[PDB]
Design a protein around this nucleic acid. Structure first.
Lengths: 488, 488, 163, 163
RNA sequence: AUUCUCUCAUAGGGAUAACGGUGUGGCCUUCUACCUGUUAGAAAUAAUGGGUCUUCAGUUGUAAUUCGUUGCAACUGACGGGGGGGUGG
C-alpha cells in the first residue's frame, strides 16, 4: 500500500461523499419545490439550485473537479510529501459571529488537503488514543461529547455539592506558539512518525500561529498541546472536559478548582497565550443554599444539567418550539396569508391535507416518523428495536419528565391556536369550516380525536408526544447505550 | 435479529474456532513427528494425538458435539433466557499452583455458556466502556496491558521519584459478596438491560461467592465491583492499573499512596472481603538514594521498568535463554546422546542440517522468520512494512540496548559451545568433523561466517540478533503504535 | 515523654490557663491551686490528687491542636501516644508538641515515630508490628499481654510452686 | 548540585527571563549580558562577576515556587540546600526542581534527602544528625567546624612546628 | 462534461453522449400481541380490511430466594404547558 494509493483512496472518497451530498441536495430541493407549489399555489416561488460558493474560489474545492483529476492530484501530493515540499493550500476561511460577541473562524481546506488531514491525523489519533484525556473533543457536535455530559451529570447527582468552572480556549488555539507544539512532539509517549511530523509542520506552516479549529487536525494538535494541562489537572484530582474552544472543570472541593485555575494560568504563560474564563460556581441540590456564588443549573451544549435532572437548555427548547410553530404556520397559516389563493387546496369534506402535512412534519422532526404503535411495541417487548431519529436523538440524556410534559401541552395548544387562526383566515376568504373536523376540536379533544382518525389504515393524525419517545429513549439507553442510539 | 439467532451464531463460531484449533494441533503434531523421526532416527518416539481432557467431562465441552447440535442448544438456551430459567452449567475448573504459593482457579465454561458470556458481557463492556477506568484488564496476557505499562514507564522517566504500591485482589474476586455486585448494577451511569442483569445474576447463581476469573464475564464484573475504588483513587490523584488479580498504584507523592492504602482498606471493608499487598516503595534514578524502602526496578508482567529504561524481566530472559538453549540442545546434542544413531543424519561435507534447523528455529522464536535483509529494508525505507512476530512481539516497549547486546553475546557463545560439544560427541561416535564448517568457526567468527553462507540464495545461517529487531520494533512503534505491532 | 514538662512547668503558664477554654475555677479553688503550686516551685506534683487537673489545664491547648490536626492521642502519667492513619498528621503533631514545649519554656522528648501494619505486610518507614501500651502488646491482629507482664506472671506462679 | 545547569543552560531561557519578575535591565545592560553570553555558547560563566546576576535571573521562578511551597533554601555557587519542617514540602521541592530542570532543558541532580533530629532521638527516614555547610558542621545542638576544616587547621599548625 | 482515456500530472490534452442521484410501488427478509368479517379450506393457515392495549410507581397475596432480588395476579397514582381579561365557589 503506497502513499499515492492511500491518497487517491481518501481524496476519491471525500469527493464522492460531497458529490452524493450535492445530488441529494438538489433532489430534495426539487421534491420540496413540488410540495411548495402544491402548498402556495401560484404564489409559490420557483426553484433555485445553488452550488456552494467556495467551489468557485478554487477548483480543488469543487468535488466534481477533484473527482475528475484525483489521480493526478494524488500523484503530485505523494511526490510532494516524499520530497518534503508539500504545503496545504489556503483554507477557505469564514469568520462567523459567536453569541458571546467573538468570532469562530470556520476553515474549509480543499478536498485534497482535507483528505490528507484525515488520512494522517486520524491515524495519529488512533495510535495515540491512550495518551490523551478521556473527555477531549474537537467539535461541539461530536456525538461522544454526550459521554462527558453523562459523567458530569452522574457526579452532579452523586455529589450533591460540586464546584464547577468554565473556560474559553478560543485565543489559545487561534494563537498558540508553534514552537510549543513542536516541543510536545516527543513527550508523553506520543508516537509521531517523521512523515506525520512533516505533515503536522506543513499544516502549521500554511498557518502561522494557532491551530486550525473545526478541522480534521484540530483534535490531535489540541490534545498534543494541552497534554500537560490535562496531566496537571488529573493529578489535582479535578475532572474536566474540553469541547472545541470550551473547557469545564468540576470537583467536590473548592481548593481543587482554584488550583485548577492556577494550573490553567501557568499553562497559559508557558504557551505564551492567555486562556480566559467565560467562571467559578457551586451546583447544589435545589433549595439548599450556597456560600460562594452559586447556580443550580449548568448549560452543557444543548443540555441544562442540574443536581436533580438533565433537561434541555432553554435556547434548545426555544429552537424546538420555533421549528414546530413554523411547521404549523407554513402549512396552515402562511398559504392563506398570500394575496391570492390560486392553486391552494382549501380544506373541505372534513379533510385538511395541510394539517396532515404539518402533523407529519412535526412527527419527523420529533419522532423521525415513528408511530405511537411502534414506540409502544418497543416499550412493551413486542419489538426488539426502534430507530431513534428526530430532535430527541440529539438529547438522549434528558430525564426531566416535567419539561417534556410541558412541551406536550405546548404542542397541543399551538396546534389548536394555529388551526383556529386558519379557520378565521379561511372564513375571511369565504370558506366557513368551523364545523369540519380540523377546526371543530376543542384543545382538550385534539389528541383523542386525532388518535382515532386513520388514513390508509395508519394513524397519521396522532399528535407527537415527547414523553413517549423519552420512555423509548430510556429503554434504548438501557439496552444499547449512548453510541448506538446516537448513530445506528 | 432474534436472541436464538444470536446464540446460534456465537456458539457456532466458538465451536468452529475450537475445531480449527484441534485440526491445526494434530496437523502440527504430524509435521513435528516427521521432523522428529528424521532427527532422532529409529529412536524417535511415535505420534500420540491427544484430545483436551475436559472434552469428556461433558459433551458440551467438546466442540465437535456442540457443532453437531448447536441449533437445538441455542433453541433451548433462548427459551431458558426468555423464561428466566437459564443457568450456566458448572465450569470445568482446575486450580493451579501460583508462584506466590496460592492457587489460580482456572475455569472453562462449556461452549454454549462461554458463547453466552461473550455475547452478553462483550456488549455490556462496549456499552459501558467510558464508565470504566483506563487501565483495567482481565487477563495478564491482555495485549492492551502494554498501554498501562507505557504509562507507568513514561511517568517513571518524567517523575524521577515515584512512589509505587502493589496489591493482590485474588481473594476479593474469589469471595466478593454478590449483594455488593448487585448493588452496583444501578450506579455510576452503568447501562445494564434487564436481560443482561438476568444473565449476570445467572452466572453469579451458578457460582456462590466471587467472580469467575479468566473468563469472558471477568472484566465486566471486576470493573463494576471496583468502580468506586477507581473513583476514589482517581480523586486522590493516584494513577493505577488492575490486571487480572493484581493492582499497581503509583504517584509522585507519598501521602497519596498512603491514602490509597486507606482507600483500598475501606473498599475491602465495604466488600466484606480483604485485599492484601504482595507492598510500598519508591523508585528513584539509579545512584540517587532514598528515604523510604526503595527499589530501582519494578516487575510489571514480563517487563522490568526503571526510571531509566524498560527491560525484560530476569525470569523472561531466563525463559528466552531456556528456549534458545533447548533448540540448540534438541537439534545438535540430544540426537547424539541417544543409545544408537540409527537413522540420524551425520554432519559431513561441510553441511550440518541440524544446525540449519536450529538456526531457523531460533530465528522463528526471535524474529518470526525475518531475514536481516528484510529488517534492514524496513529500517532504511525500502520496505514500508515488516511483520513483527516471535518473542520480541511480546516485549515491544523494551528500550535497554545493553540487555539485548548481552543476549546477542550469549546466543553466539551458546551456539559455539553446543557446536563444540556436538563435535565432541560426534568424534566419540567415530565422526571427526572439527575441520568442517559447523565446528571449525571460532566464537568471534561464527556471526560473520554464517552471514556469508547462503543456501538457495537465502542467508539461512545468519545468527539472529535481538538488537536489529529492536531497532525495527522502535521504528514500527513510531509508525504504527503498540496495537498494530502487537496484532497485525 | 512528658516527665520533664510536669517536673518543671512554668507556674506562670498554668496561672495563665486558669481563665481559658471555658474552665470553671472559683476564686477559692484558684487559691488552693496556687497554694499547692507555691509549696512547689516549678512543676506539677505527679502521682497525686492534683496531678490530673493541672496536667489537663496545662495541656488543654496541645490537646485542642492535636484534635484539630485529626490525630488521636492519649496521655497517661508522663507518657503520651499519638496515632493516625496519615504520616503528615503525626509529623505535624510532632511540630505541635515542639511549639507547645517552647510556649511552656520546657521540652518534651520522645521515648519515637513508627508505623504498625498487618503482620507480613512490609513498611516504608521504620516499622513495628507491636506496641507496648502498659501491660499490653497491641497489634493490628490481637491484643496480648506484654512480654514483661508474662514474665511477671510466670515469676509469681513459679515462686508459688518453689515456695 | 546545579553545576551542569550553569555549565549548559539554554541562553534562550536566560533571555526569556529578562523581562519578568520586575527586573530592571536597561537595553545596554541587555546588550552586555547578551555579549558575554555570546562569547560563551551555553551556560553561565561560573566564579565571575556576571555569575550571580545570571544565576538569580535564571532561578527566579524556582525560587518563587520553592518560596510558595514554604521551603527555605540557599544557593551557593553550584550548590543548593532546601530545608523544611515537613517531608511533603521537601518532596514537592524535589518535584519543583525537576520541573524547572525540564523547563531549562538541563538536568539538576542531587549530591539527597534526609532528616536532622536531636542527637539520641531516632528517625524514620534515612537520617543524619550533622550537615556539612561549607566549613561548618551544623547540628540541632551546635555549630562546629567540619572535620576536613579541623584537619586543615591541624595540618597548618603541625607544619608550622615541623618547619 | 461530474463518463472514458493519455501526459514524469494540485496542471494540461483529447474521444463519446453518458454518468451520478431522488419520490412512489413491487419482490426478497429482519422483529411484531390479541379479536374479528370475507377470499381461498376441510379448522392447517396465507394475503388482505377494521378494531383494542402495549409504559412507569406503590400496596397486598402468592412461588423461588445463595437474603441484592425475581415471575404472576389485582387495586389505585400520575401518563398533553403557561399567560392575559372577566366570573363563580
Amino acid at each position: 500500500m503506497k502513499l499515492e494509493q492511500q491518497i487517491q483512496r481518501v481524496i476519491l472518497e471525500e469527493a464522492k461523499a460531497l458529490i452524493k451530498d450535492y445530488h441529494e441536495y438538489h433532489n430534495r430541493v426539487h421534491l420540496e419545490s413540488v410540495r411548495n407549489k402544491k402548498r402556495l399555489g401560484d404564489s409559490a416561488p420557483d426553484k433555485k439550485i445553488h452550488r456552494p460558493n467556495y467551489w468557485s474560489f478554487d477548483k480543488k474545492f469543487d468535488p466534481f473537479y477533484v473527482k475528475s483529476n484525483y489521480k493526478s492530484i494524488a500523484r503530485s501530493i505523494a511526490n510532494k510529501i516524499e520530497n518534503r515540499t508539500y504545503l496545504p493550500n489556503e483554507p477557505f476561511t469564514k469568520d462567523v459571529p459567536k453569541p458571546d460577541g467573538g468570532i469562530r473562524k470556520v476553515s474549509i481546506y480543499q478536498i485534497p488537503d482535507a483528505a490528507i488531514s484525515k488520512l494522517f491525523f486520524n491515524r495519529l489519533l488512533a495510535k495515540n488514543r491512550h495518551r490523551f484525556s478521556s473527555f477531549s473533543y474537537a467539535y461541539r457536535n461530536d456525538r461522544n461529547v454526550h459521554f462527558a455530559i453523562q459523567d458530569i451529570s452522574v457526579d452532579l447527582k452523586k455529589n450533591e455539592r460540586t464546584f464547577l468552572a468554565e473556560f474559553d480556549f478560543s485565543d489559545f488555539f487561534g494563537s498558540i506558539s508553534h514552537s510549543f507544539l513542536n516541543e510536545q512532539f516527543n513527550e508523553n509517549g506520543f508516537y509521531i512518525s517523521p512523515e506525520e511530523k512533516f505533515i503536522i509542520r506543513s499544516f502549521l506552516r500554511e498557518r502561522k500561529v494557532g491551530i486550525p479549529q473545526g478541522t480534521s487536525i484540530s483534535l490531535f494538535l489540541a490534545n498534543l498541546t494541552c497534554w500537560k494541562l490535562d496531566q496537571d489537572l488529573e493529578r489535582e484530582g479535578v475532572k474536566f472536559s474540553r469541547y472545541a474552544d470550551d473547557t469545564i472543570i468540576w470537583s467536590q472541593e473548592y481548593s481543587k478548582i482554584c488550583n485548577a485555575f492556577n494550573i490553567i494560568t501557568n499553562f497559559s504563560k508557558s504557551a505564551g497565550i492567555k486562556i480566559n474564563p467565560k467562571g467559578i460556581s457551586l451546583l447544589t441540590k435545589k433549595g439548599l443554599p450556597s456560600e460562594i456564588t452559586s447556580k443550580n443549573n449548568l448549560d452543557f451544549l444543548g443540555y441544562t444539567l442540574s443536581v436533580e435532572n438533565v433537561s434541555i437548555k432553554e435556547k434548545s427548547v426555544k429552537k424546538i418550539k420555533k421549528q414546530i410553530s413554523y411547521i404549523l404556520y407554513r402549512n396552515l397559516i402562511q398559504p392563506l396569508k398570500k394575496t391570492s389563493l390560486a392553486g391552494q387546496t382549501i380544506p373541505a369534506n372534513d379533510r385538511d391535507k395541510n394539517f396532515l402535512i404539518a402533523i407529519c412534519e412535526i412527527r419527523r422532526y420529533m419522532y423521525g416518523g415513528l408511530s405511537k404503535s411502534q414506540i409502544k411495541d418497543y416499550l412493551s417487548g413486542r419489538s426488539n428495536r426502534l430507530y431513534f431519529k428526530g430532535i430527541m436523538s440529539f438529547y438522549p440524556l434528558v430525564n426531566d419528565v416535567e419539561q417534556l410534559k410541558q412541551l406536550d401541552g405546548w404542542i397541543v395548544s399551538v396546534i389548536y391556536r394555529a388551526l383556529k387562526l386558519r379557520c378565521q383566515l379561511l372564513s375571511k376568504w369565504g370558506y366557513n369550516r368551523s364545523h369540519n373536523f380540523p377546526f371543530i376540536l376543542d384543545r382538550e379533544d385534539i389528541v383523542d380525536k386525532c388518535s382515532k382518525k386513520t388514513i390508509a389504515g395508519r394513524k397519521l393524525f396522532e399528535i407527537p408526544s415527547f414523553l413517549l419517545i423519552h420512555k423509548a429513549l430510556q429503554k434504548g439507553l438501557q439496552e444499547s447505550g449512548i453510541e448506538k442510539i446516537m448513530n445506528p
